[PDB]
Amino acid sequence: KLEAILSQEVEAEIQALLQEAEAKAEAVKREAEEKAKALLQARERALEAQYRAALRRAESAG
Amino acid sequence: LVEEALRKALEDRYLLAHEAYAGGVPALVVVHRKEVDQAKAALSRAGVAE
Lengths: 62, 50
Fold this sequence. Notes:
The structure is cut from a larger assembly and holds chains A and B. By secondary structure, chain A is mainly α. The longest helix of chain A is centred in the last third of the chain and has 35 residues. The relative contact order of chain A is 0.06. In chain B, helix 1 packs antiparallel against helix 2. In chain B, about 10% of the residues are buried. The PDB classes it as membrane protein, hydrolase. Keywords: V/A-ATPase, membrane protein, complex, antibody, hydrolase. Thermus thermophilus V/A-ATPase bound to VH dAbs. Chain A: V-type ATP synthase subunit E. Organism of A: Thermus thermophilus (strain HB8 / ATCC 27634 / DSM 579).
C-alpha cells in the first residue's frame, strides 16, 4: 500500500545517519587511545634520559 | 481518463481524491516525493495540467 512507501523513505536515512555517527564515535575514541599512548611514550623516554645523565654525573663527581 | 493514466503510470501507491463543488470536480493527486516527474508526465499525456 501507500503507507508502506512512507516507512521506506525514513527507514534508510535513519540507518545512513546512525551508521555515520557510530563511526565518528569510533574515530574520536581511536585517536583518544592513540594520543594517551603517545603522551606516555614521550614520558617513558624522558625518565630514561634523566637516569642515564644522572648516573654519569655521579660517577664524574665522585 | 486521468485516473487510468495515473494508475498505469504510478501503480497503486498514488492517491486520487476528488470532492465536488457543483459542476466538475477539483481533483487532487497526492504522490510521493521524487515521484513528481512521473506524476506530471501522466497529467500531461491526458492533456490536463496543474
